[PDB]
Amino acid sequence: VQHRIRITLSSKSVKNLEKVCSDLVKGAKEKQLKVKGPVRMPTKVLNITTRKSPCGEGTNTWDRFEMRVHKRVIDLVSSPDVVKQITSITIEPGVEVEVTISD
Amino acid sequence: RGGGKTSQIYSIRQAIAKSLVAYYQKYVDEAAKKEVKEIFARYDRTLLVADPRRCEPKKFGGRGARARFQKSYR
Amino acid sequence: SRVCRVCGNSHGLIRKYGLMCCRQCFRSNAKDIGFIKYR
Amino acid sequence: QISKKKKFVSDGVFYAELNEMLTRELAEDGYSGVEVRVTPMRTEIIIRATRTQNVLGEKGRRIRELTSVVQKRFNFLENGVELYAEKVVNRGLCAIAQAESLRYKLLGGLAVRRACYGVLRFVMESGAKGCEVIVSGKLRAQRAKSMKFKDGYMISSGQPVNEYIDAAVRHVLLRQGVLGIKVKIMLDWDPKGKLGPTTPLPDLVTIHPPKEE
Amino acid sequence: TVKDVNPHEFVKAYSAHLKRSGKMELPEWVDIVKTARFKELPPSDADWYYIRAASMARKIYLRQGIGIGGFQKIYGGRQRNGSRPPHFCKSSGAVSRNILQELQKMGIIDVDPKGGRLITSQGRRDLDQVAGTVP
Amino acid sequence: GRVRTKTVKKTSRQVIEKYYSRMTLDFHTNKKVLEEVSILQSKRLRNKVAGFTTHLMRRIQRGPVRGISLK
Amino acid sequence: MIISKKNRNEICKYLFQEGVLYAKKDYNLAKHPQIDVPNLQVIKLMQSFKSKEYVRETFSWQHYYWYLTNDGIEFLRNFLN
RNA sequence: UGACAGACUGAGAGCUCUUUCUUGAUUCUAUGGGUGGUGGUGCAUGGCCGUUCUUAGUUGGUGGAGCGAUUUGUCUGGUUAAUUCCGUUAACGAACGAGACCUCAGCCUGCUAACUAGCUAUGCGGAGCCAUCCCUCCGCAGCUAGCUUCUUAGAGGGACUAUGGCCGUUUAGGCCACGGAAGUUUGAGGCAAUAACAGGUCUGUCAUGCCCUUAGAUGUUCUGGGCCGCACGCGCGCUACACUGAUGUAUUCAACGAGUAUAUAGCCUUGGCCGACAGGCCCGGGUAAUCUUGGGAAAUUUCAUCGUGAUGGGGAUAGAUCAUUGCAAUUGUUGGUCUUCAACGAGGAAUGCCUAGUAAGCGCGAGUCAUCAGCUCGCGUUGACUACGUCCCUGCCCUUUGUACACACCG
Ligand SMILES: [Mg+2]
Ligand SMILES: [Mg+2]
Ligand SMILES: [Mg+2]
Ligand SMILES: [Mg+2]
Ligand SMILES: [Mg+2]
Ligand SMILES: [Mg+2]
Ligand SMILES: [Mg+2]
Ligand SMILES: [Mg+2]
Ligand SMILES: [Mg+2]
Ligand SMILES: [Mg+2]
Ligand SMILES: [Mg+2]
Ligand SMILES: [Mg+2]
Ligand SMILES: [Mg+2]
Ligand SMILES: [Mg+2]
Ligand SMILES: [Mg+2]
Ligand SMILES: [Mg+2]
Ligand SMILES: [Zn+2]
């Protein structure tokens, strides 16, 4: 009856992601789901080094950019009709949600 | 796990010392543990306390954390 | 046979992650694509 | 299927390609920014500008052409991405629109010193802790010389530059050169978040008075 | 047993072990090769092939799923490229292979489910007792 | 190299003027006192201020002192 | 330029059905998406619609955005309809 | 307008011709104007960057002094990394810069959790053993946790010179000592002011004025060469001159990061087989803490072998051959195999960087990339000598001082 569903969630912003995950989590606790998370996953740090000159003279000075991508997952023991009963509330900016039906 | 070779020796020393003092403090006695800490900290202090020193990032304009490319005027 | 998505220049690209920009167009659009420069 | 790194990079490139293309289109409408929102069964492009019925055209036509060209260019499922085009609550703070206004005022033939303070006193009255303008190029003389115009406070270093300075760069196509226009505008602290940012500058202290009982 | 003894004399005992504990086949190119591209000379050892076997035997003893390429990798080394900077070069694989078919035809090890080579329950017996017979 | 700057020193004078009997000498009390009688945006500035008002208290609690006005 | 009635028509249909048109600068594809053309013909006939100001053109970094005008809808309405 | 047969031309470019079919107002011609240019001018400009300048410096409002340019504020002293502060005070009050701010790293047996991470215990399973059970190392799965130390990352906490001492106008502070992970601001960076320079870039841009070119083109495309040619000088580096070493076994330990439908397995590549090597064939895994890879890195560590010898140090030069990438390897792409074994004996005048996980030694990843990393950007491993000062040299900041200099002593 009660299936096993997973929620895959990632963003660019610490605060904003932490707000979205807690929203889903307290949603789950209001409906007394068997919920397990939010497990935190190591942050993937895209980096670039670029010679900040546009012509190539002067002191060789580079600049480093870094996009951090923060990975989070939650496990829910529910039916997908309950999943769409829950996960329709506001989603805060920039955060991304890709629910997956697992084994 | 991890580290190098001598780094692992220096972790083993630390973890033996720190597990000894934790085990005595929780299961033998505080006062009886005091003699152990005072012997160890008498020999040295780095048995018990980690070393804050790490490898610090290398800055552009020279291979080396604190070095630079060789400089030529002519 | 590969140029910028931006200025159509075939020197100094940044092909990693599929940016397909040159090193200067990437600085010019750097912080709006999202390469926030903490360091 | 694509990795998440590529996912985020391609979404960023989409944001930038809009942020740029929407400028040549919405130059004569007072463009200020675009926000992209991902919803269930829909994707949204939030054009924000200063004049809304002329970006709508007559009876919402111009937005129709723009949504069609975005659909087509980025190969979106039809009805996939839709446009709202709202109005920036305050106009003296979004440095893009102020720089563009200086651009048209300066193109039309209006004097440079008149044009810059026409921007500057507007920015001052409209609640900004300071403003700077730099005009650089060949104005009334061949040899290049750059004019700075100021009013009020301004920060230049450290982190809060990003949270307080709305800064723009524009190029102008006056005959016989190009005028560069830098517009820097200081924002003011609104804890509400409506008008200026939420967290105040790292050098401000509020010693509360001693309520008595 | 095996972990309880010095990591060298176990190999020194075991190299003579699968010399004298019966015998087996051995391809007829053992004597020419360098056993790794970056090397410079054939091994000085006369019974180098048996020591190769003993070392790989304890590798498989204390790990599961070690491959034809993993054995290449764990036996490669530093390659001075000439005036070029030195680098890492994987060892040669066909030397490791016939060691694996020797230990397999002896039943010391065998191919693994999920890939690799796992110690055999009786090969475990062989290595444990030969290690027990060390100082 | 540990000279406190003008922001720290004048928050020190102003807060210890404006609130005297509600601060003490023990450092760690003062931190939280100031956390509830002031709004700041850097816990290191917060400790930096408390560490100076504490010996301002030490000097006042023995003798007299400059600008601050206490009733 | 050398173009067929057929190619003119398959663009004229498409503009009267959509209203916008998008090219790319990458040249010699032989297939612009959403129509059948090698991108010379589209870019250049739309250029000529620009010269006769039937379409407004915002070049937008080598992507050729052409927005039909109501000046040009009468032309196309007098061509195919 | 496109073309079949041949010359032409390398050219299966119908460019040009013999040959006349084909298409139909899409043109061609001529008159303007466009368009395009890695064309010129960085000395017409934007923009961005570098530098002056890594230092601590700069500017209005009101007031004072001066006919005036200008000066005061911005300072006599003390303190500081600091125009940082105490304070003095014709100054008063304010703005940038400094500091504050941001990031990474260091600490937490405290909190939230986590079978994509991982101990721990029990159950079995293998192997050794006073063996019958146990004790030790191993593999497998769990309604094992009143699991989260290890791993990840969120929120926080922590350090302020707080305590003590001495010096100090007992002010700003400084030196010392317990404590603490941390007492050069804890370390390292990011950002970084006014005024500039005739600093760099029109060769980053459908950024750009002017000028030159616009078909017999500085446009664009194609074929080939060229940027790589070597008497010779200079610059950053790579490899060495050995024995504190080379070669050959054995032993075993990171972190950064990286991985397009890539089509009929396809970037990273596991396992199996073929192969001395290069490299091949097969079934696979991963859009990733899941598969590669819990990255089995070298230096280092032991066991021998060489024994002061241009030797087995050193590996340039060249010969012969195979293989992979590429439509294409020639002026050797690269990698192997075998052979050749060149100069180099610690380096002249001079000169570079460097004060603790630092120099130095060592490898790895990334960019570039169809293949080419002696480079550049990051990551870890081993890991020190000396110094804690000074103005002697080379400079920067401030004050007094002299100037016949001001494109400013390169006067
Ligand atoms: Mg110049
Ligand atoms: Mg310029
Ligand atoms: Mg005056
Ligand atoms: Mg006067
Ligand atoms: Mg004045
Ligand atoms: Mg620092
Ligand atoms: Mg060259
Ligand atoms: Mg260099
Ligand atoms: Mg060796
Ligand atoms: Mg040699
Ligand atoms: Mg020097
Ligand atoms: Mg590479
Ligand atoms: Mg004189
Ligand atoms: Mg005189
Ligand atoms: Mg003069
Ligand atoms: Mg002279
Ligand atoms: Zn570009």
Automatic annotation (TrEMBL), chain A:
Top-level division of the source organism's lineage: Eukaryota
Start and end residues of each Small ribosomal subunit protein uS10 domain: 6-100
Keyword Iron-sulfur: no
Gene Ontology cellular-component terms listed: small ribosomal subunit
Keywords: Ribonucleoprotein, Ribosomal protein
Keyword Protease: no
GO MF annotations, alphabetized: structural constituent of ribosome
A biological process from GO: translation
Family statement: Belongs to the universal ribosomal protein uS10 family.
Record-given protein name: Ribosomal protein S20
Automatic annotation (TrEMBL), chain B:
Family membership noted in the UniProt record: Belongs to the universal ribosomal protein uS9 family.
Protein name: 40S ribosomal protein S16
Complete-protein stretch covered: 76 to 149 of 149
TrEMBL record, chain F:
Superkingdom, natural source: Eukaryota
Parent-record interval covered: 2 to 72 of 143
Protein name: 40S ribosomal protein S17
Species classification: Eukaryota, Viridiplantae, Streptophyta, Embryophyta, Tracheophyta
Similarity comment: Belongs to the eukaryotic ribosomal protein eS17 family.
From TrEMBL, chain G:
Domain of life from the UniProt record: Eukaryota
Subcellular location: Cytoplasm
Plectin/eS10 N-terminal domain ranges (all copies): 3-81
Family recorded in the similarity comment: Belongs to the eukaryotic ribosomal protein eS10 family.
Protein name: Plectin/eS10 N-terminal domain-containing protein
Lineage, highest ranks first: Eukaryota, Viridiplantae, Streptophyta, Embryophyta, Tracheophyta
